[PDB]
Amino acid sequence: SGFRKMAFPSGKVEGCMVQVTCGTTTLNGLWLDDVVYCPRHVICTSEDMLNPNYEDLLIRKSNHNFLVQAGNVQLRVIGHSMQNCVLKLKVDTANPKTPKYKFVRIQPGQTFSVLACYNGSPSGVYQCAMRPNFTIKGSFLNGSCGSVGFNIDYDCVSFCYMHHMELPTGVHAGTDLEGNFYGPFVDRQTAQAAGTDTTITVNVLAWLYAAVINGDRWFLNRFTTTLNDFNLVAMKYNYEPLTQDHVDILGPLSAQTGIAVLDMCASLKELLQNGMNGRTILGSALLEDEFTPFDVVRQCSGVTF
Amino acid sequence: SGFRKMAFPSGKVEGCMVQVTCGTTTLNGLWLDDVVYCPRHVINYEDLLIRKSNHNFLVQAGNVQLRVIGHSMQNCVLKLKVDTANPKTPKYKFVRIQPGQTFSVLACYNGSPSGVYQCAMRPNFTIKGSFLNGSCGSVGFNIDYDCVSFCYMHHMELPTGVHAGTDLEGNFYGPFVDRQTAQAAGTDTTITVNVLAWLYAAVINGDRWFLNRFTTTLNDFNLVAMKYNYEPLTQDHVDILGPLSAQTGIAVLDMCASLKELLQNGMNGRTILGSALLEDEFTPFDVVRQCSGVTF
């Protein structure tokens, strides 16, 4: 019993964290085999950030300008190249603690664990989701740039995020491990803002099925809804449109509890209309959207209470 | 910016998790040097233990089988002397925590870690964790510099879904026993010093709507706290909140006048740090550490 926001064990990622210094800037790098991956803005000054020309800044650098530190040992840089918004530093030593890994690009609504670092030293781990507006509601301070997001399934680490910057509203933006940003953001000090954020509907539904499994049904009603009428109402509360793909994904949770997806959609409609009336669902007074259908099946028991 | 329930990096603990089997029961063990620590219920415990021999206990570390060469009991924990010392043994201490203090939990099944999460020791000595069957032997810890301080070992789940366990010396937290009997958690209270610390974290993050010009005596606040099922706030708690009061410029008894107003009138449709409830699982030290950047 119990339902917590759970992160993956961080050990396989801790062994890849290094410190990168270029001039006066210091941030984090990911050391996998004989390559260190980090944000390309490590080559920029604060002034350069208004309109940086990365190709012109990189051409003026040599390998010995980049200092890479792994614990107490200094790694020697023997090459450098750029791939989108990531800098790849070829080093003379391969990482002996390199785990089995993949670089994957996630879609909005997908969750992941974040290992927050400062000076190539891990300080904490937490779970979060890629928001519909492509931002992350994380917890980051200055020096955290280059911290990474990941999922672990079996003995394989799937790297999905690298932290690049914080926006005026306190939210965070970054790239996949190939240097392509999530969202319409640039690694430039520009007047860019996060778009209006919406609630991840498929995730709220999954979390309602988790409440049923753990033994709670007070929020259920005797009504059903068409998929179209549900989206007409939910759009009015800033909820993401629910697609037929989302319905298909919720299939096993619907089968395990005996509650059809469009019947769970009717409880959500009523919950939005009435509020909680002093009650909680799984210890929360708000409707939770940072747990995917896959996370609910992974964490919750296979036997309903 | 941002405020999340953060756990310590679990790597140093992952390298100590092993699987223990005795008869039909299978649970988790902590391998430190040449000893494996696990709940004694894996087996009148003294009389049950005397019958057993070393070869009855099967210890598995990853793919390798460890051979048991001795066994002894300490309170509610079983200590299995193994023939191999753990090469990944970190620098460690066994510490007993007090109610209100927080810690990270590495949840395991079959000696294999599956997740990490942060939680607090409640005033009623239970933990609101997330555990399934096979999680027995999962451990709680904190990290200070490079030293792992083990504070909890999971033993059982209670009828209300909450969890109970011991320190690493086998002494339970709370009035619980390791056996199938009628045991219930006592009435729980809110950790007042922790709610106040979380309100200071909201002012550091630009949330100030709940602030006011009023102050209160510590005695007038404890009478309001007694009515709302909140733990009594002591002078020690006031002293502990000193650096957060100095950093924000808001005196502790001014922050108590804000908590008094939130306990009577509620939030009025508003949230604090993305929450509609008052949060009590962040200590004053956790607030200072998350709003500073201490690394390990």
Ligand SMILES: CN(C)C(=O)c1ccc2cncc(NC(=O)Cc3cccc(Cl)c3)c2c1
């Ligand atoms: C907001 N202030 C003043 C902080 O000290 C702060 C606070 C928190 C921070 C969290 N993450 C990153 C940080 N910094 C940057 O975004 C660095 C940067 C600047 C401009 C463009 C790019 Cl692509 C990168 C953080 C910085």
Ligand SMILES: [Cl-]
């Ligand atoms: Cl995805």
